Design a protein around this ligand. Sequence first.
Ligand SMILES: [Cl-]
Ligand SMILES: [Zn+2]
Ligand SMILES: [Zn+2]
Length: 341
Amino acid sequence: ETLNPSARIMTFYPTMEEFRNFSRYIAYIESQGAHRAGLAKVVPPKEWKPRASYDDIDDLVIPAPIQQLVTGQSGLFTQYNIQKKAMTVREFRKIANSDKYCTPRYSEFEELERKYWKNLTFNPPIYGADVNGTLYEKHVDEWNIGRLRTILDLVEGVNTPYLYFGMWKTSFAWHTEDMDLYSINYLHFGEPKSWYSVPPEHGKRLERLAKGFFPGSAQSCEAFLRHKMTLISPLMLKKYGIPFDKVTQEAGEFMITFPYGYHAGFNHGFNCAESTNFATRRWIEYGKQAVLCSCRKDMVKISMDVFVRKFQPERYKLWKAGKDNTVIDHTLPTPEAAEFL
Ligand SMILES: [Cl-]
Ligand SMILES: [Zn+2]
Ligand SMILES: [Zn+2]
């Protein structure tokens, strides 16, 4: 409670020594209260690079590019997907940089952010989303998104890497991760990516507001935000007193999302990001209490039995019977942070 009381987005600059152990560094940022914002930025040391160059990926195939059609007014929107046929990075880059789809002229970020919210229902862009793969070279052992080696490995497509090829005005809707897990996002190259976040301790406030604005979606599915179709502007959040923060990610930077941390955002122009999900001992309780989508068969569901028997042996008999009345404290850091406190 005393650490990061304002629950604002924190930025970290680790040394090569600190950076070498991923699991230990996540425990350190939690001891500083980074988790309270629900989103944190990590700038890696200058000497670290995951790949020598990105000049040999023109013929990489994007199997399912998606055209994003948006409908709405007065800060409330719904995004619909149209799956297009397979295209290459070369073909996607030519479309992204053409006069029809390129980034507009602007002086400061606040101007581009106004242009995004004013024009998001016009000229639908194409997002090169959910590409199975990695851009990390084999010999890279530090912060390798393809092999983080957290306790989530005990499960084994949530523990595999994904690529995102963006263009101006492509967006990601308000959501938490599958099973309310953590996530890591690295921006390989190109134009920035802007993020919005709601502290996990205020997450139920956002859900109540969203349920009020979309009553039909709430009856059909309790966890309707997991469909990733709902867009809400910062001005609408301010008008209904929902606490939030904003941050811009640049090429070469990492973004970390925390359990039950709601996030949304947009791409400034042509770029490429890589992501995966991970876990700590603290996630276990969030995973047991996660509210899942019930209207879709193909949804992500992990059995918690293995994590409870291995890390909570005393509580397994009670949990499996239905006697676990544990209340989550969102301000508490992970148990692995003890050495820093
Ligand atoms: Cl390139
Ligand atoms: Zn996400
Ligand atoms: Zn659903």
